[PDB]
Design an enzyme around this catalytic site. Structure first.
Site, PDB file in Angstrom:
ATOM      1  N   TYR A  17       0.763  -1.249   0.000  1.00  0.00           N
ATOM      2  CA  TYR A  17       0.000   0.000   0.000  1.00  0.00           C
ATOM      3  C   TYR A  17       0.800   1.310   0.000  1.00  0.00           C
ATOM      4  O   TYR A  17       0.335   2.314  -0.538  1.00  0.00           O
ATOM      5  CB  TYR A  17      -1.003   0.003   1.159  1.00  0.00           C
ATOM      6  CG  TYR A  17      -2.089  -1.038   1.017  1.00  0.00           C
ATOM      7  CD1 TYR A  17      -3.131  -0.862   0.117  1.00  0.00           C
ATOM      8  CD2 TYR A  17      -2.070  -2.201   1.776  1.00  0.00           C
ATOM      9  CE1 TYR A  17      -4.125  -1.813  -0.020  1.00  0.00           C
ATOM     10  CE2 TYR A  17      -3.059  -3.152   1.651  1.00  0.00           C
ATOM     11  CZ  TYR A  17      -4.083  -2.956   0.750  1.00  0.00           C
ATOM     12  OH  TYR A  17      -5.068  -3.907   0.619  1.00  0.00           O
ATOM     13  N   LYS A  35       5.120   8.282   4.638  1.00  0.00           N
ATOM     14  CA  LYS A  35       4.423   7.269   3.844  1.00  0.00           C
ATOM     15  C   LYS A  35       3.717   8.018   2.734  1.00  0.00           C
ATOM     16  O   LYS A  35       2.810   8.808   2.991  1.00  0.00           O
ATOM     17  CB  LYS A  35       3.421   6.493   4.710  1.00  0.00           C
ATOM     18  CG  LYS A  35       2.866   5.203   4.089  1.00  0.00           C
ATOM     19  CD  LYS A  35       2.222   4.306   5.159  1.00  0.00           C
ATOM     20  CE  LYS A  35       1.760   2.979   4.587  1.00  0.00           C
ATOM     21  NZ  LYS A  35       1.020   2.161   5.589  1.00  0.00           N
ATOM     22  N   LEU A  85      11.028   4.961  13.708  1.00  0.00           N
ATOM     23  CA  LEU A  85      11.660   3.950  14.562  1.00  0.00           C
ATOM     24  C   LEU A  85      12.823   3.252  13.863  1.00  0.00           C
ATOM     25  O   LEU A  85      12.830   3.104  12.642  1.00  0.00           O
ATOM     26  CB  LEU A  85      10.637   2.937  15.082  1.00  0.00           C
ATOM     27  CG  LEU A  85       9.860   3.484  16.284  1.00  0.00           C
ATOM     28  CD1 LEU A  85       8.597   4.150  15.841  1.00  0.00           C
ATOM     29  CD2 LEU A  85       9.547   2.374  17.260  1.00  0.00           C
ATOM     30  N   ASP A 129      -3.378  -7.184  10.104  1.00  0.00           N
ATOM     31  CA  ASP A 129      -2.168  -7.461   9.351  1.00  0.00           C
ATOM     32  C   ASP A 129      -0.932  -7.559  10.241  1.00  0.00           C
ATOM     33  O   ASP A 129       0.144  -7.052   9.888  1.00  0.00           O
ATOM     34  CB  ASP A 129      -1.992  -6.434   8.239  1.00  0.00           C
ATOM     35  CG  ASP A 129      -1.090  -6.930   7.119  1.00  0.00           C
ATOM     36  OD1 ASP A 129      -0.916  -8.170   6.962  1.00  0.00           O
ATOM     37  OD2 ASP A 129      -0.558  -6.066   6.391  1.00  0.00           O
ATOM     38  N   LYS A 131       2.233  -8.806  11.410  1.00  0.00           N
ATOM     39  CA  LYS A 131       3.355  -9.646  11.008  1.00  0.00           C
ATOM     40  C   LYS A 131       4.654  -8.900  11.333  1.00  0.00           C
ATOM     41  O   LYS A 131       4.628  -7.684  11.540  1.00  0.00           O
ATOM     42  CB  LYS A 131       3.256  -9.982   9.521  1.00  0.00           C
ATOM     43  CG  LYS A 131       3.353  -8.782   8.625  1.00  0.00           C
ATOM     44  CD  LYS A 131       3.161  -9.187   7.168  1.00  0.00           C
ATOM     45  CE  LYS A 131       3.089  -7.942   6.293  1.00  0.00           C
ATOM     46  NZ  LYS A 131       2.736  -8.231   4.873  1.00  0.00           N
ATOM     47  N   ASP A 147       1.505   0.020  10.585  1.00  0.00           N
ATOM     48  CA  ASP A 147       0.729  -0.398   9.432  1.00  0.00           C
ATOM     49  C   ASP A 147      -0.723  -0.743   9.637  1.00  0.00           C
ATOM     50  O   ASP A 147      -1.080  -1.868   9.649  1.00  0.00           O
ATOM     51  CB  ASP A 147       1.392  -1.458   8.604  1.00  0.00           C
ATOM     52  CG  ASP A 147       0.737  -1.601   7.283  1.00  0.00           C
ATOM     53  OD1 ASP A 147      -0.149  -0.832   6.968  1.00  0.00           O
ATOM     54  OD2 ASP A 147       1.085  -2.476   6.544  1.00  0.00           O
TER      55      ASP A 147
HETATM   56  N1  LIG Z   1       7.547   4.749  11.378  1.00  0.00           N
HETATM   57  C1  LIG Z   1       8.440   3.961  10.744  1.00  0.00           C
HETATM   58  N2  LIG Z   1       9.749   3.959  11.094  1.00  0.00           N
HETATM   59  C2  LIG Z   1      10.646   3.177  10.468  1.00  0.00           C
HETATM   60  N3  LIG Z   1      10.320   2.341   9.467  1.00  0.00           N
HETATM   61  C3  LIG Z   1       9.042   2.240   9.026  1.00  0.00           C
HETATM   62  C4  LIG Z   1       8.002   3.069   9.651  1.00  0.00           C
HETATM   63  N4  LIG Z   1       6.841   2.784   9.030  1.00  0.00           N
HETATM   64  C5  LIG Z   1       7.110   1.849   8.085  1.00  0.00           C
HETATM   65  N5  LIG Z   1       8.420   1.534   8.081  1.00  0.00           N
HETATM   66  C6  LIG Z   1       9.057   0.555   7.181  1.00  0.00           C
HETATM   67  O1  LIG Z   1       8.421   0.636   5.905  1.00  0.00           O
HETATM   68  C7  LIG Z   1       7.796  -0.607   5.576  1.00  0.00           C
HETATM   69  C8  LIG Z   1       6.433  -0.312   4.967  1.00  0.00           C
HETATM   70  O2  LIG Z   1       5.668   0.357   5.964  1.00  0.00           O
HETATM   71  P1  LIG Z   1       4.095   0.076   6.062  1.00  0.00           P
HETATM   72  O3  LIG Z   1       3.463   1.290   6.694  1.00  0.00           O
HETATM   73  O4  LIG Z   1       3.955  -1.255   6.752  1.00  0.00           O
HETATM   74  O5  LIG Z   1       3.800   0.046   4.464  1.00  0.00           O
HETATM   75  P2  LIG Z   1       2.870  -0.975   3.615  1.00  0.00           P
HETATM   76  O6  LIG Z   1       1.450  -0.597   3.931  1.00  0.00           O
HETATM   77  O7  LIG Z   1       3.227  -0.654   2.184  1.00  0.00           O
HETATM   78  O8  LIG Z   1       3.282  -2.340   4.076  1.00  0.00           O
HETATM   79  C9  LIG Z   1       7.684  -1.390   6.878  1.00  0.00           C
HETATM   80  O9  LIG Z   1       7.889  -2.795   6.703  1.00  0.00           O
HETATM   81  C10 LIG Z   1       8.774  -0.819   7.756  1.00  0.00           C
HETATM   82  O10 LIG Z   1       9.942  -1.635   7.641  1.00  0.00           O
HETATM   83 CL   LIG Z   2       6.938  -9.841   7.905  1.00  0.00          CL
HETATM   84 MG   LIG Z   3      -0.165  -1.857   4.926  1.00  0.00          MG
HETATM   85 MG   LIG Z   4       3.381  -3.350   6.074  1.00  0.00          MG
END
Ligand SMILES: Nc1ncnc2c1ncn2[C@@H]1O[C@H](COP(=O)(O)OP(=O)(O)O)[C@@H](O)[C@H]1O
Ligand SMILES: [Cl-]
Ligand SMILES: [Mg+2]
Ligand SMILES: [Mg+2]
Lengths: 298, 10, 261, 10
Positions: A17, A35, A85, A129, A131, A147
């Site tokens: 996403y 994001k 983070l 979700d 994981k 996420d």
């Molecule tokens: N606040 C954050 N700080 C550091 N890394 C992040 C953060 N948010 C997301 N990430 C990294 O980016 C990846 C994608 O973020 P996420 O919000 O889970 O996107 P998607 O919905 O595309 O999976 C995550 O697996 C994580 O490793």
């Molecule tokens: Cl994973």
């Molecule tokens: Mg997601």
């Molecule tokens: Mg994710």
């Protein structure tokens, strides 16, 4: 600030996403995760996943849930600004695959994940979700749920929600078997899988299709029947021809775990969603009597 | 695996 | 799945806290230069029909009305634009609540091309900005749903009737804007229960909610009138909707003459 | 879901 006040430092994430960057506020120096969400290629406006994620996150103020700091909504772009983070649990597990994560740290992380999750559930939010790659750790020992793009506000009682929920390996059997109703228990199942994964350094149920996933579960926990799970033979995707495997001993499944750990894990992977342990009750489990907050080695 | 997507309706 | 007990109280308590925050201004219509309660009633009644055409959840309807009242509480709108606000609100409520939200083009179609896709999308942006993305509002619907758990065994006719009564409250801003969703839900539940079984608001609910039958009175009197005069009302989409067997045709039931309460 | 039916300007 705005678009112009952030310096992009690097792409840190890709997912189903979101496009995610590490960036820094040029004016305050604050490091954030950006994001990015394209409204472009979007002839439907703001994606429902973004709408749910933003509105649910604004209501979810907790030490173990990632902080949404800002939303920048323009004509073509939608930016979510999060606290940054250090890394996700997946990266940490891979960096730890040789040595292993110290048991005290596994216990701390699980305890914190349950606190975040119980907070969600108490505020009528299903994550859907959970994981390792959606869980974020910092350098001081904290872990947080992230996420919320697949998250949903839920009703009491629950309604039929989206069938296509949860990454395969962490997907609960009631979903695989095609129940129309599902609830908070699906998040507990995912967490159980993640628990076992931290302990053994391997995914518990790494299926490569829905039926493979289901059989991996059956082979480990035993094929469910009407006695362990009343109603199971009536589920839409249940077949009387499923092989009947016996349940394995947990000392064979999670060797490193003591009796308390095995007790809690078994309760998180209970077949019957109605008897599967809740986040709130899990927090009271004897497994957590000695919980501390160690620092990870990064 | 990746996060799953909603099946198309019709 | 079926069990909901552990976080039941927490969720109810949280919703009771949200409802006194996600609140629209009781008399905001006096400050609108160009639109009236009658126009709002026409809009909502239309949204009921839209929800039926597209088989949207009742929750989606309640959410849309919530968004509309909050938006109109702080934005002046000309009558010729009121339907655009309502269309954007329904679209947003659908995206939040539905598995399958209708696409924007479809929303443009049910207004009969009164507005363009660009307008609907631009209005969506404005509503999101004005509500600050706070879309997860508590509704009369959510409170009813929880209240229904106190019915053992369940009574589907009572549930449909309560939902019917709850939906009628959406049409008339005066006087329903002055009551919190939880209280409307309470009066609706009691009134439906009483009509169908002659029973009354349960002590278990009174305890849980803090509402005695006495505290329901003011709202209950209004809801009873609304119920009695429903066949007369200018807006009829809700009565038509609840004549269906889907809802046990509860809109065909006769209201009780008095409450003796 | 969707079962479009009719089109009205208010
Ligand atoms: N606040 C954050 N700080 C550091 N890394 C992040 C953060 N948010 C997301 N990430 C990294 O980016 C990846 C994608 O973020 P996420 O919000 O889970 O996107 P998607 O919905 O595309 O999976 C995550 O697996 C994580 O490793
Ligand atoms: Cl994973
Ligand atoms: Mg997601
Ligand atoms: Mg994710």
């Amino acid at each position: 600030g705005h678009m112009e006040n952030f310096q992009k430092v690097e792409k840190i994430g890709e997912g189903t996403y979101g496009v995610v960057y590490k960036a820094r506020n040029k004016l305050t120096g604050e490091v954030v995760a950006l994001k990015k969400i394209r409204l472009d290629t979007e002839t439907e406006g703001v994606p429902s996943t973004a709408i749910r994620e933003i509105s649910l996150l604004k209501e979810l103020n907790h030490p173990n849930i990632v902080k949404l700091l800002d939303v920048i909504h323009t004509e073509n772009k939608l930016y979510l600004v999060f606290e940054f983070l250090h890394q996700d649990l997946k990266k940490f597990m891979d960096a730890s695959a040789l040595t292993g994560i110290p048991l005290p740290l596994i216990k701390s992380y699980l305890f914190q994940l349950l606190q975040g999750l119980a907070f969600c559930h108490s505020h009528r939010v299903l994550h859907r979700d959970l994981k390792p790659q959606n869980l974020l750790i910092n350098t001081e020992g904290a872990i947080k749920l992230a996420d919320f793009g697949l998250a949903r506000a839920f009703g009491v009682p629950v309604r039929t929600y989206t069938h296509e929920v949860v990454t395969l390996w962490y997907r609960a059997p009631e979903i695989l078997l095609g129940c129309k109703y599902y609830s908070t228990a699906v998040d507990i199942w995912s967490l159980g899988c993640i628990f076992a994964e931290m302990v053994t350094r391997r995914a518990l149920f790494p299926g490569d299709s829905e039926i493979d996933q289901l059989f991996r579960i059956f082979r480990t926990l035993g094929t469910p029947d009407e006695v362990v799970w009343p109603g199971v033979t009536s589920m839409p995707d249940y077949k009387p021809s499923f092989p009947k495997w016996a349940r394995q001993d947990f000392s064979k499944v999670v060797p490193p775990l003591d009796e308390d750990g095995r007790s809690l894990l078994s309760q998180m992977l209970h077949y019957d969603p109605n008897k599967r342990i809740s986040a709130k009750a899990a927090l009271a489990h004897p497994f957590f009597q000695d919980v501390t907050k160690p620092v990870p080695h990064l | 695996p990746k996060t799953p997507k909603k099946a198309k309706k019709l | 799945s079926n069990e909901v007990p552990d976080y039941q109280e927490d969720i109810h308590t949280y919703l009771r806290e949200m409802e006194v925050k996600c609140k629209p201004k009781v008399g905001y219509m006096k400050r609108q230069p160009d639109i009236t309660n009658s126009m709002r009633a026409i809009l909502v009644d239309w949204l009921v029909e839209v929800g039926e055409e597209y088989k949207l959840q009742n929750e989606t309807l309640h959410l849309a009305v919530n968004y509309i009242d909050r938006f109109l509480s702080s934005m002046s709108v000309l009558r010729g634009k009121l339907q655009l606000v309502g269309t954007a609100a329904m679209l947003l409520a659908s995206k939040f609540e539905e598995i399958y939200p209708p696409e924007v083009a479809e929303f443009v179609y049910i207004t009969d091309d009164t507005y363009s896709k660009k307008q609907v999308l631009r209005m969506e942006h404005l509503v999101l900005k004005v509500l600050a993305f706070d879309l997860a509002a508590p509704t009369v619907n959510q409170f009813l749903t929880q209240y229904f758990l106190h019915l053992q065994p369940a009574n589907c006719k009572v549930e449909s009737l309560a939902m019917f009564l709850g939906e009628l409250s959406l049409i008339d801003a005066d006087p329903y804007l002055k009551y919190l969703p939880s209280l409307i839900a309470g009066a609706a539940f009691h009134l439906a229960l009483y009509t169908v079984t002659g029973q009354s608001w349960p002590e278990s609910l009174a305890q849980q909610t803090g509402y005695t039958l006495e505290s329901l009175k003011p709202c209950l009197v209004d809801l009873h009138q609304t119920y009695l005069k429903a066949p007369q009302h200018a807006q009829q989409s809700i009565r038509e909707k609840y004549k269906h067997s889907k809802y046990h045709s509860v809109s065909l039931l006769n209201p009780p003459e008095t409450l003796s309460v």
